[PDB]
Amino acid sequence: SGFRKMAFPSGKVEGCMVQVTCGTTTLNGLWLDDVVYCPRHVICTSEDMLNPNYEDLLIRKSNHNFLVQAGNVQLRVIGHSMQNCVLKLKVDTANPKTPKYKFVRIQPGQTFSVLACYNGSPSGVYQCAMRPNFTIKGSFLNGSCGSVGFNIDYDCVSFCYMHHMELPTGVHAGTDLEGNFYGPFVDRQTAQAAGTDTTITVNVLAWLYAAVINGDRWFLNRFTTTLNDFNLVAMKYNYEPLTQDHVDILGPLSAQTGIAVLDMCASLKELLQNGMNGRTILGSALLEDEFTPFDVVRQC
Amino acid sequence: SGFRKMAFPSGKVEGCMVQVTCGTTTLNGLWLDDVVYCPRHVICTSEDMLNPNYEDLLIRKSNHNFLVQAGNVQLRVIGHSMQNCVLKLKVDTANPKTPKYKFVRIQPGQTFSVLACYNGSPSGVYQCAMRPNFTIKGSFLNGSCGSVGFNIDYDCVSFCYMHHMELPTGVHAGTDLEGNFYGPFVDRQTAQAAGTDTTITVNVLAWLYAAVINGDRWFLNRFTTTLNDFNLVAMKYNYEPLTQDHVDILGPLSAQTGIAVLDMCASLKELLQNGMNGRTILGSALLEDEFTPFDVVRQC
Numbered sequence: 001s002g003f004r005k006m007a008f009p010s011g012k013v014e015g016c017m018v019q020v021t022c023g024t025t026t027l028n029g030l031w032l033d034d035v036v037y038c039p040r041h042v043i044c045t046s047e048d049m050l051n052p053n054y055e056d057l058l059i060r061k062s063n064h065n066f067l068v069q070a071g072n073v074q075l076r077v078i079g080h081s082m083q084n085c086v087l088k089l090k091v092d093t094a095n096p097k098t099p100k101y102k103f104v105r106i107q108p109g110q111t112f113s114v115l116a117c118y119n120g121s122p123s124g125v126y127q128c129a130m131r132p133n134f135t136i137k138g139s140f141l142n143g144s145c146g147s148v149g150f151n152i153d154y155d156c157v158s159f160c161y162m163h164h165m166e167l168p169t170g171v172h173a174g175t176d177l178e179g180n181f182y183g184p185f186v187d188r189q190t191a192q193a194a195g196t197d198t199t200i201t202v203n204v205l206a207w208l209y210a211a212v213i214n215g216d217r218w219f220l221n222r223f224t225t226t227l228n229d230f231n232l233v234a235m236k237y238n239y240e241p242l243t244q245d246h247v248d249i250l251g252p253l254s255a256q257t258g259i260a261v262l263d264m265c266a267s268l269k270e271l272l273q274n275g276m277n278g279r280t281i282l283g284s285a286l287l288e289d290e291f292t293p294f295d296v297v298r299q300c
Numbered sequence: 301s302g303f304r305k306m307a308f309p310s311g312k313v314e315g316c317m318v319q320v321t322c323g324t325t326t327l328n329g330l331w332l333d334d335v336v337y338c339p340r341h342v343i344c345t346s347e348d349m350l351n352p353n354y355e356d357l358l359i360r361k362s363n364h365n366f367l368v369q370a371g372n373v374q375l376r377v378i379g380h381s382m383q384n385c386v387l388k389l390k391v392d393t394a395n396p397k398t399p400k401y402k403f404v405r406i407q408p409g410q411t412f413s414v415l416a417c418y419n420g421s422p423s424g425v426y427q428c429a430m431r432p433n434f435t436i437k438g439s440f441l442n443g444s445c446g447s448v449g450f451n452i453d454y455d456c457v458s459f460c461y462m463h464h465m466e467l468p469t470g471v472h473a474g475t476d477l478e479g480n481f482y483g484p485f486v487d488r489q490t491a492q493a494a495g496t497d498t499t500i501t502v503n504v505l506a507w508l509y510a511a512v513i514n515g516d517r518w519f520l521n522r523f524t525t526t527l528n529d530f531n532l533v534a535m536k537y538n539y540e541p542l543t544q545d546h547v548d549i550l551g552p553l554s555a556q557t558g559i560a561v562l563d564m565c566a567s568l569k570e571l572l573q574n575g576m577n578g579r580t581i582l583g584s585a586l587l588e589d590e591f592t593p594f595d596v597v598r599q600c
């Protein structure tokens with residue numbers, strides 16, 4: 001029992017992290033087979049960071065302009081190319097610690113693990129969700145650019161996020177591993193605002209199911225509701241519309257607990273309308289929305 | 301910016317985890333140099349688990365009674381011994397992945413990272429605090445016995461916790477790596493109750509400082525208080541007495557923010573007396589007490 005924000009063990013990713021430097025600009029890269037992937041922002045000097053023309057900047061560089069250090073060992077760069085907002089640096093050595101991996105893009109509302117790194121050295125691991133507005137509420141300091149987010153199934157690491165920048169308001173923005181930003185952001189050092197966010201309804205429901213699996217049942221009630229009258233109340237509270245497909249995914253949790261999805265929705269409506277009254281669910285005084293149904297099943 | 305429950309990267313520990321089996325009883329072990337450490341409960345058959353006499357049980361075993369599997373490779377057991385509630389199994393192979401390590405016992409109120417494992421295979425990593433009543437509010441299923449908790453400084457892993465059992469109420473109990481239980485528990489399959497718990501005051505204050513470092517300032521106020529009138533209100537709310545030594549440790553956070561410790565205590569007293577009024581601090585609607593001052597500094 002118990003329920004924690006739980007990350008995947010990070011060792012398979014720690015073995016891929018390297019430092020990349022161009023000029024005096026330095027950040028983290030990801031070394032898989034004989035390629036290092038990193039944010040293209042690394043080719044900016046301080047005077048280029050506000051308004052780079054990356055094709056311009058990159059045509060002015062050669063391979064020897066890029067210093068890649070894997071721990072103590074510098075990796076000889078033997079080729080380079082841009083792919084969207086990531087740089088690919090071919091090196092003369094294949095990483096002997098390369099895991100089985102894939103590059104996957106995730107959906108808003110899905111979770112992943114973040115290995116935060118500084119100067120190529122891993123620092124901490126934590127679980128994060130991609131928000132509906134394509135930001136993540138991460139924990140990142142100066143020097144974390146290039147840190148990666150990932151999931152693991154069996155032995156295979158699905159890389160899904162490369163960290164680029166912190167917005168005003170202090171949330172974080174980045175790309176998938178093909179260099180394509182999540183959300184409407186660009187890799188320049190200008191202030192960019194996140195669009196309005198919403199609460200991930202299916203996740204809140206998943207976490208309420210987790211609570212029942214773990215013996216928190218105080219919020220349950222005898223009522224039910226239709227999908228639609230629920231969405232009418234949800235809309236009021238800045239919750240994502242719940243769809244019949246969300247209902248279908250909650251199926252297995254509904255089965256294991258014997259609580260119909262639309263009955264749990266009735267509990268959710270009352271929690272939204274009454275608050276929690278100084279009570280807690282799974283140690284929280286808020287409705288938690290960064291656990292997917294898969295996370296609940298994986299941990300319960 | 302941002303503030304998350306952040307664990308240490310787990311790779312150095314993942315490389316030490318093995319499976320130990322005696323009879324039909326199986327759990328996780330820790331392979332460091334040529335020794336495997338695991339809960340002595342592994343020598344219990346189902347009929348022994350309620351009321352074992354471990355010295356009895358162990359004198360009836362030989363080395364070949366212990367099956368140790370490191371991934372696919374079985375480790376030849378060449379000696380065995382009891383140390384308190386841990387078994388030490390000398391094996392014929394030194395673990396080539398052994399990190400620099402130490403066995404340290406932690407204090408209540410301190411934090412560590414838990415690598416949860418099943419059948420010797422690591423499953424997830426998360427951050428936990430040792431509660432004042434020497435339990436931990438972990439996340440652990442059947443098969444997690446022998447999972448370890450740890451901290452990392454530079455390259456050195458300080459192992460501090462080996463998981464043994466889940467209490468009623470669903471909190472977790474275990475030992476340090478010399479086999480000495482945290483708290484007044486014994487390694488038998490009987491129901492044992494945790495003693496009353498308290499809130500870790502110095503940690504709540506540390507986290508309020510983290511909030512200020514991160515721009516949450518709504519809870520600050522112009523008042524101050526003495527150490528003692530604070531402890532009078534704290535006592536009422538089941539908070540640990542705050543000591544002048546706790547005040548001294550908060551020094552560096554007080555410096556970086558310019559907020560006197562006893563002024564932050566005045567904010568805490570008002571938060572305790574008024575509640576949060578449906579507002580949040582660092583995304584939480586509760587006063588969080590599982591971040592030490594070191595965790596705040598490490599992340600802020």
Ligand SMILES: Cn1cnc(Cn2c(=O)nc(Nc3cc4cn(C)nc4cc3Cl)n(Cc3cc(F)c(F)cc3F)c2=O)n1
Pocket residue numbers: 024025026027039041042140141142143144145164165166186187188189190301
């Ligand atoms: C507080 N914070 C939270 N997350 C981040 C991530 N982040 C970062 O780590 N570095 C950035 N700018 C750099 C400055 C450098 C100075 N030297 C010597 N080398 C440097 C390398 C970088 Cl990458 N930025 C800013 C930033 C990075 C981008 F990739 C981008 F497209 C726009 C940006 F404004 C940053 O946000 N810091």
Ligand SMILES: Cn1cnc(Cn2c(=O)nc(Nc3cc4cn(C)nc4cc3Cl)n(Cc3cc(F)c(F)cc3F)c2=O)n1
Pocket residue numbers: 001324325326327339341342440441442443444445464465466486487488489490
């Ligand atoms: C739900 N939960 C949360 N944490 C735990 C940890 N835990 C565990 O993993 N296993 C336990 N008993 C075993 C049964 C076995 C059956 N087979 C085939 N092999 C087994 C090995 C164990 Cl270790 N227990 C119970 C338990 C383990 C102890 F070490 C102890 F001293 C007393 C106990 F009651 C357990 O709590 N499960």
